[PDB]
Amino acid sequence: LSLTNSSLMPTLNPMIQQLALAIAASWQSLPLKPYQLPEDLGYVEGRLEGEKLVIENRCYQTPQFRKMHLELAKVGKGLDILHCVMFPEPLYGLPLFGCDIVAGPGGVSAAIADLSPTQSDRQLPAAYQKSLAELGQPEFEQQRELPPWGEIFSEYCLFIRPSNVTEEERFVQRVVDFLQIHCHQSIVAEPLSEAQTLEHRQGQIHYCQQQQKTRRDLEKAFGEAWAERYMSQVLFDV
Numbered sequence: 125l126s127l128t129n130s131s132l133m134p135t136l137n138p139m140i141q142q143l144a145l146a147i148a149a150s151w152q153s154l155p156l157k158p159y160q161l162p163e164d165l166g167y168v169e170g171r172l173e174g175e176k177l178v179i180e181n182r183c184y185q186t187p188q189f190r191k192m193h194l195e196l197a198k199v200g201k202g203l204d205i206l207h208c209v210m211f212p213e214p215l216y217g218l219p220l221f222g223c224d225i226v227a228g229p230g231g232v233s234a235a236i237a238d239l240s241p242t243q244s245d246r247q248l249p250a251a252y253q254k255s256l257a258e259l260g261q262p263e264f265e266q267q268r269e270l271p272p273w274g275e276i277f278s279e280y281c282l283f284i285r286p287s288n289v290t291e292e293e294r295f296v297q298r299v300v301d302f303l304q305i306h307c308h309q310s311i312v313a314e315p316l317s318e319a320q321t322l323e324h325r326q327g328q329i330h331y332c333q334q335q336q337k338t339r340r341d342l343e344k345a346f347g348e349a350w351a352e353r354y355m356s357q358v359l360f361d362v
């Protein structure tokens with residue numbers, strides 16, 4: 125796992141670069157194994173109205189995380205994207221870590237991050253709540269409203285338009301905190317019963333189903349069949 129061979133990192137919005145480096149630093153601490161995507165989908169290049177569209181996908185796995193995906197994209201000249209999900213192995217009942225940034229050369233327009241509950245409770249595990257509790261509330265001046273296809277998200281979800289670099293740094297630090305808690309608990313987690321495993325797996329199907337609400341730009345560049353394969357095999361496999 126390493127981003128030093130990325131062709132995109134040097135032209136991506138700096139908060140995106142920061143967050144990618146922070147996710148890498150986190151994941152490098154896990155016993156990562158490679159996760160194979162379709163051969164053509166590791167590195168994607170096309171055109172979107174005459175401007176280069178480029179996507180780099182990196183995917184890993186652990187016994188606790190079925191699929192760890194980091195996507196970076198430059199979707200023509202005025203859109204940069206980071207999308208990251210860690211899909212937990214449902215046997216372990218961990219929450220879904222997710223984060224997305226949408227940016228341009230002018231700055232960041234949306235940043236979101238959560239540890240999303242898989243538990244039919246919609247609660248996070250006790251150890252997460254206690255560790256999260258001791259961090260305290262970060263302050264944000266523009267918090268955005270979740271569409272109806274929330275709250276597959278948790279109470280700790282941040283969904284914002286950063287107002288200045290201090291908010292960019294605060295957003296990234298909260299993701300670094302989320303990851304420190306998450307990785308640590310993954311190392312300590314024990315297999316659930318079959319019943320609760322299936323419960324968690326359904327929470328994961330529902331989370332991926334809901335998130336089908338990105339397509340449009342991919343359809344525009346690649347068509348609808350390519351887009352629907354990408355959504356169902358790369359992004360949000362069910």
Ligand SMILES: C=CC1=C(C)/C(=C/c2[nH]c(/C=C3N=C(/C=C4\NC(=O)C(C)=C4C=C)C(C)=C\3CCC(=O)O)c(CCC(=O)O)c2C)NC1=O
Nearest residue numbers: 179197199203205207224226233234236335338339341342
């Ligand atoms: C390479 C793939 C890819 C493309 C081409 C892409 C495009 C894309 N994402 C957008 C926004 C967005 N996209 C998301 C979020 C997500 N999007 C997701 O696929 C997931 C899983 C989330 C997480 C919830 C959010 C929250 C916005 C808000 C737009 C903004 O406020 O800037 C917009 C709005 C810009 C506009 O139309 O004016 C475009 C064009 N996003 C992509 O990921």
